[PDB]
């Protein structure tokens, strides 16, 4: 039977990019897909245009399209959900205002997931602020659990890979064990202190190839500021690269990661995590995923004082956003 995949904000730049890749088989391969596309009413005219284009692609893997502005219809029997839709950042809008505006959206979508989606639904939150939006959706999804939710830091992760590969002058598939800790924000911790690069014989630690000043300074600022830089250049969002990251995240989450491969995923903090992060937020960790689709935090990593401090700062921000989010929802 076909798999039911939801994309919210489907008429937007990320939704658009994601829809055609999923429709043509990039996510589930040969398995047929029924795309659920959710928009708000003012975007429905454009969304029907997207549906026309999908038909005009003649992709055999696309078994059906459900375009709607009704959450009950959008979330019904969904197996996979990309929560991309969110209020647009107008000129001059601050992060704090965006948090408040989106809080209500993810409360509604959390409830809709709980009541309408399959109990096994895998929910990836892309819309910003991703970690906190994910927290809100999960908080309002009583029929679901922590295993159903994650927030996307995979674009931060892919950015780190691309940049370190270029710095080292190696192809991207020769870089391993990169990590982005914490929040999808400027307090994210791009951490290559565990990363390795393939040489002729075996591997080489990235920290042995490059100086500390770069790895903990310039590199960090480069990745943390990359989203703003793309926006500045294009005068638009990082659509294709974000859609790509979302697919990579979901693919690894659904089918598992290869041995040795780490992927950064914002996940509910378990009390047993070995890095001292307190439960109660969505926090990006280095993860593996087994063939059952179960996420496992990578253990046994030595955290230096610099990484430790950065990890603490981003946790503190995540806690702040939560409290800010809970207060606005309380009304």
Ligand X SMILES: NC(=O)C1=CN([C@@H]2O[C@H](COP(=O)(O)OP(=O)(O)OC[C@H]3O[C@@H](n4cnc5c(N)ncnc54)[C@H](O)[C@@H]3O)[C@@H](O)[C@H]2O)C=CC1
Residue from 172, 218, 228, 276 binding its own copies (CB under 8 A): 172
Residue 184 among the catalytic residues: yes
129: cis peptide before it, omega within 30°? yes
Q: Which residue, judged by CB position, is nearest to ligand X in the bound state?
A: 12
Work out how close the CB of 240 gets to ligand X at its nearest, in angstroms, rounded to a whole number. Answer: 10
CA distance 39 to 296: 33
Distance from chain centroid for Cα 204? 29
CA distances from 313 to 183, 229, 286 (A): 10, 23, 17
Catalytic pick among 184, 194, 249, 296: 184
Query: Pseudo-torsion of CA 128, 126, 311, 294, nearest 10°?
Result: 150
DSSP state at residue 43: G
Select the residue interacting with its own copies from 1, 94, 200, 232 (CB under 8 A).
232
Of 40 and 63, the one with the shorter C-beta distance to ligand X is 40
Question: Which C-beta is closer to its own copies: that of 96 or that of 229?
Answer: 229
- Identify which of 276, 330, 331, 324 has the alpha carbon closest to the alpha carbon of residue 132: 324
Task: Return d(Cα 284, Cα 282) in angstroms, integer.
Answer: 7
Q: Indicate the burial class of 62 (C-beta count within 10 angstroms; 0-12, 13-18, 19 or more).
A: buried
Binding test (CB under 8 A) with its own copies, winner from 16, 82, 181, 253: 16
Specify burial of residue 273 (Cβ count, 10 A radius: 0-12, 13-18, 19+).
Answer: middle
Q: Which is nearer to ligand X, 12 or 268 (CB)?
A: 12
Measured CA to CA, the distance from residue 90 to residue 69 in angstroms comes to 22
CB atoms within 10 A of CB 300: 5
Interacting partner of 50 out of ligand X, its own copies, none (Cβ under 5 to 8 A depending on kind): its own copies
Nearest to 322 by CA among 194, 181, 161, 139: 139
Q: Tell me the pairing of strands 179-181 and 175-176.
A: unpaired
155 binds ligand X (CB under 6 A): yes
Least distance from its own copies to the Cβ atom of residue 185, Å: 17
Residue 107 in the binding site for its own copies (CB under 8 A): no
Task: By CB under 6 A, name the one of 5, 11, 67, 117 that touches ligand X.
Answer: 11
Interface with its own copies includes 225 (CB under 8 A)? no
Ranges within 112-171 binding its own copies (CB under 8 A): 155, 158-159, 161-163, 165-166, 171
Query: Which positions are catalytic?
Result: 184
Name the site residues for its own copies (rule: CB under 8 A): 11, 16-17, 19-20, 24, 45-46, 48-50, 52-60, 155, 158-159, 161-163, 165-166, 171-173, 226, 229-236, 238-241, 244-245
Name the site residues for ligand X (rule: CB under 6 A): 8-9, 11-15, 38-40, 43, 84-89, 98, 105, 126-128, 130, 152, 155, 184, 237-239, 242
């Amino acid at each position: 039977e076909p798999i039911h995949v939801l994309i919210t904000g489907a008429a937007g730049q990320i939704g658009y990019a994601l829809a055609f890749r999923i429709a043509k088989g990039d996510l589930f391969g040969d398995r047929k897909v029924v795309l659920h596309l959710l928009e708000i009413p003012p975007a429905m005219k454009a969304l029907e245009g997207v549906c026309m284009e999908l038909q005009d692609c003649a992709f055999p893997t696309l078994a059906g399209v459900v375009a709607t502005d009704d959450p009950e219809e959008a979330f019904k029997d969904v197996d996979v959900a990309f929560l991309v839709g969110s209020f647009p950042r107008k000129p001059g809008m601050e992060r704090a205002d965006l948090l408040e505006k989106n809080a209500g959206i993810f409360k509604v979508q959390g409830k809709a997931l709980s009541e309408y989606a399959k109990p096994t639904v895998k929910v990836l939150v892309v819309g910003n602020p991703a970690n906190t939006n994910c927290l809100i959706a999960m908080a309002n999804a009583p029929k679901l659990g922590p295993e159903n939710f994650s927030a996307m830091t995979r674009l931060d992760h892919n950015r780190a890979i691309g940049e370190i590969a270029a710095k080292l002058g190696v192809p991207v598939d020769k870089v391993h064990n990169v990590v982005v800790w914490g929040n999808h924000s400027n307090t994210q911790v791009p951490d290559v202190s565990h990363a390795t690069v393939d040489k002729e014989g075996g591997t080489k630690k990235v920290s042995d190839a490059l100086p500390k000043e770069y790895l903990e300074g310039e590199f960090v600022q480069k990745i943390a500021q990359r989203g703003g830089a793309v926006i500045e250049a294009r005068g638009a969002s990082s659509a294709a690269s974000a859609a790509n990251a979302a697919l990579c995240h979901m693919r690894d989450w659904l089918f598992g990661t290869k041995p040795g491969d780490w992927v950064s995923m914002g996940i509910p903090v378990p009390e047993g995590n070995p890095y001292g992060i307190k439960p109660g937020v969505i926090y990006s960790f280095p993860c593996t995923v087994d063939k059952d689709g179960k996420v496992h935090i990578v253990e046994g990593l030595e955290i230096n004082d610099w990484v430790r401090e950065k990890m603490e700062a981003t946790e503190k921000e995540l806690i702040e956003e939560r409290e800010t989010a809970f207060k606005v929802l309380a009304q």
